[PDB]
């Protein structure tokens, strides 16, 4: 976990995120999305639960990226929830929720759901 | 947004979270869950997209809580994605993803999805 | 269950659905949405698991509505997954997935997620 | 669509489902799950929106399976929402919601979310 999480990860869409897993569960870094109403790097922050594991389970973690930087303001935020699996072919398997700011009338259609798999190799 | 987000919020399950929205999109605080394999306060970190809004839309945001503290280690993490609506009756409407660390065989059933509504009044 | 499910239900958005729960787990009926790219009634079909319950649990069920009828073709379909709780104030609590047909390039943003609560009284 | 949907499909977990897409949007068939609290074949019913497409988009569809048959009663139901893409390598990409019947107290943790990709070849 932690040490193994720190580094650069790539997903199936071509996005990249670099993260540092701190000793006490913190995750800090940047995310660069290959799709969307995103351009450049965005700040990301999250947490992971280690003290994960005498039965080779994954380490649960999650992070958030608000899609605003000095080049774009997409008025939305995405949260990724999943687990890290280390080893030869380590990966982070996730499901994400992307919410856009809407008027109350369109709040029912404000959230998209999807999944992403990240590897240390691209892809 | 930001100023309006800062404070204590309560949801329909009886959980409470106190957060500080920093000038540049950061969200930091603690979460205390009324249900689950949670006991006491857990650290939370997230982001919000302001610079939100000439058409009274909500402010998109998200945060993560790893369910580990000095009393419990639930080997899981939850991410909440939604938007803040201010005013007389301000609220944060969210959808969440709770992922538990599993063995590869049970990874298909590792994530729960739900929704929570937070108000400044309980509830 | 079954008998209790049969009838007209209304949700918080003003939609209405009438369903018949058949003896062997089938659910058939129509749905009329108050929002969206929907107009009039659409056919719905689903299933419920009864033989549900010596510990007052809910009955799990789900149904699908393809948003095409003789007035509109929204090129999308919604599935609702949840459980029925009977009694004085019976309700069906659900989470739904709305998928739109997209080109491969936009498939990552093809699905919306939300939740709806249905009651026998409106609302 | 329709004709192309009819047939046997296999997903990454080893499950199999055979379906018939009827002329007017109906989907009927059986599902056999390789995981879970499932054993044998279960009935499935759903809908698809064709009249799908001068820009090679997918056909939106969804179906439900209640996990009860003459060998098992798992007190749960799963709904799959996604789209069919035909061609050389046709597939059905989905996201699913599995809800279990719970007591009111555990209703917050009643639904699991995941995703499955089905192909005509296994896998
Ligand atoms: O890498 C990405 N994953 C997807 N989810 C999201 O929010 N934007 C897309 N980019
Ligand atoms: O407040 C809570 N909301 C629910 N989601 C979650 O992760 N635990 C529960 N507690
Ligand atoms: O009643 C409705 N619920 C929401 N989900 C959906 O698919 N359309 C909306 N209408
Ligand atoms: O094929 C399967 N997909 C998964 N979702 C589900 O409900 N059970 C599992 N089996």
SS3 per residue for chain C? CCCCCCEEEEECCCCEEEEEECCCCEEEEEEECCCCCCCCEEEEEEEECCCCCCCCCCEEEEEEEEEECCCCEEEEEEEEEEEEECCCCCEEEEEEEEEECCCHHHHHHCEEEEEEEEECCCC
Neighbour subunits, B (≥3 Cβ pairs < 8 A): A, C, D
H-type alpha helices, A1-123: none
CA dihedral over D35, D38, D42, D45, signed as positive or negative:
negative
D20-57 as b/e: b if 16+ CB within 10 A = ebeeebbbebebbbeebebeebbbbbbbbbbebeeeeb
Of A15, A2, A4, nearest to A98 by C-alpha is A15
Count of residues making up chain B: 123
Q: Whose CA is nearest to atom 9 of ligand 3?
A: C35
Structural domain boundaries, residue B26: 1-123
CA angle B37, B41, B46 (to 5 degrees): 100
C2: phi > 0 → left, psi -120 to 50 → alpha, else beta; which? left
Please name the residue of chain D whose CA is at the shortest distance from the CA of residue B108.
D114
* Element holding A21 (H helix, E strand): strand A16-21
Round to whole Å and give the CA distance between B110 and B16.
25
* Element holding A123 (H helix, E strand): none
Number of Cβ atoms within 10 Å of the Cβ of C70: 7
Resolution, expressed in angstroms to one decimal: 1.3
| Chain-centre distance for alpha carbon C64 | 6
Give B29→chain D minimum CA distance, Å. 23
φ/ψ of C80, rounded to 5, equals -115, 135
CB C31 within 8 A of CB C41: yes
CB D94 within 8 A of CB D117: yes
| Chain-centre distance for alpha carbon D38 | 14
Cα D8 to averaged position of ligand 4 atoms, centre (Å): 16
Q: Is C13 in the pocket of ligand 3 (CB under 6 A)?
A: yes
Cβ contacts of A98 on chain C, cutoff 8 Å: 109
Asked if D51 reaches chain B (Cβ–Cβ under 8 Å), the answer is: no
How many structural domains comprise chain C?
A: 1
Across the interface, whether the CB atoms of B47 and A65 are under 8 A apart is answered yes
Report how far apart, in Å, the C-alpha atoms of C36 and of each of A4, A105, D120 are.
45, 11, 33
Locate D32 and state its tokens. 């056999």
CA angle D82, D96, A67 (to 5 degrees): 75
User: How does DSSP classify residue B107?
Assistant: G
φ/ψ of B55, rounded to 5, equals -145, 45
CATH code: domain of residue D45:
2.40.128.30
Round to whole Å and give the CA distance between A68 and A77.
9
CB C80 within 8 A of CB D79: yes
Method for this entry? X-ray
Round to whole Å and give the CA distance between A40 and A47.
23
- Parallel, antiparallel, or unpaired: how do β-strands A91-100 and B73-85 relate? unpaired
| Chain-centre distance for alpha carbon B70 | 20
φ/ψ of C114, rounded to 5, equals -160, -170
């Amino acid at each position: 976990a932690e040490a193994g999480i720190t580094g650069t990860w790539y997903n199936q869409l071509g996005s990249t995120f670099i993260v540092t897993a701190g000793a006490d569960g913190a995750l800090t870094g940047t995310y660069e999305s290959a799709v969307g109403n995103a351009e450049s790097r965005y700040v990301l922050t999250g947490r992971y639960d280690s003290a994960p594991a005498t039965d080779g389970s994954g380490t649960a973690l999650g992070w958030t990226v608000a899609w605003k930087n000095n080049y774009r303001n997409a008025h939305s935020a995405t949260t990724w929830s999943g687990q890290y699996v280390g080893g030869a072919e380590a990966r982070i398997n996730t499901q994400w929720l992307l919410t856009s700011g809407t008027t109350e009338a369109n709040a029912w259609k404000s959230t998209l759901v999807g999944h992403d798999t990240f590897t240390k190799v691209k892809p």
